[PDB]
From Swiss-Prot:
<comment type="function">
    <text>Iron-binding repressor of the dipheteria toxin gene expression. May serve as a global regulator of gene expression. Represses ripA under iron excess.</text>
</comment>
<dbReference type="GO" id="GO:0046983">
    <property type="term" value="F:protein dimerization activity"/>
</dbReference>
<protein>
    <recommendedName>
        <fullName>Diphtheria toxin repressor</fullName>
    </recommendedName>
</protein>
<keyword id="KW-0805">Transcription regulation</keyword>
<keyword id="KW-0238">DNA-binding</keyword>
<comment type="similarity">
    <text>Belongs to the DtxR/MntR family.</text>
</comment>
<dbReference type="GO" id="GO:0046914">
    <property type="term" value="F:transition metal ion binding"/>
</dbReference>
<dbReference type="GO" id="GO:0005737">
    <property type="term" value="C:cytoplasm"/>
</dbReference>
<keyword id="KW-0963">Cytoplasm</keyword>
<dbReference type="GO" id="GO:0045892">
    <property type="term" value="P:negative regulation of DNA-templated transcription"/>
</dbReference>
<dbReference type="GO" id="GO:0003677">
    <property type="term" value="F:DNA binding"/>
</dbReference>
<comment type="subunit">
    <text>Homodimer.</text>
</comment>
<keyword id="KW-0804">Transcription</keyword>
<keyword id="KW-0678">Repressor</keyword>
<keyword id="KW-0408">Iron</keyword>
<dbReference type="GO" id="GO:0003700">
    <property type="term" value="F:DNA-binding transcription factor activity"/>
</dbReference>
Length: 121
């Protein structure tokens, strides 16, 4: 093909990303994805896929839970409090994933936006 690096195309293990504002807007459920997982059907396409099937506005309905929330780094990401039921959008950029929300754009590593509870664009 022609390269075309998708959002989930990048495979990482560590918990780090680029940009200066990695935190912001609700939806970056880092410890939330742990459990969920989609692939087809409208009922949430999962960020991993919600960025190739002609994305427009991924509707956030949920994430997972709060059980896990013991991290100083997540403290800044918790500023949004992930409001399940909101409405956000995602878009690629030079082979990278970033959720664009009214507020600003975020990073959301492949480990973060792996199994979020959103809608199928």
């Amino acid at each position: 093909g022609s390269h075309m690096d998708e959002v989930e195309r990048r495979l990482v293990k560590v918990l780090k990303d680029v940009s200066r504002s990695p935190f912001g807007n609700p939806i970056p459920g880092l410890d939330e994805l742990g459990v969920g997982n989609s692939d087809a059907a409208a009922p949430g396409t999962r960020v991993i896929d919600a960025a190739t099937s002609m994305p427009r506005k991924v509707r956030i309905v949920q994430i997972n839970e709060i059980f896990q929330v013991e991290t100083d780094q997540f403290t800044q990401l918790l500023d949004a409090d992930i409001r399940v039921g909101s409405e956000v959008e995602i878009v690629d950029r030079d082979g990278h994933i970033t959720l664009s929300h009214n507020g600003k754009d975020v990073e959301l590593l492949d480990d973060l936006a792996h199994t979020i509870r959103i809608e199928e664009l």
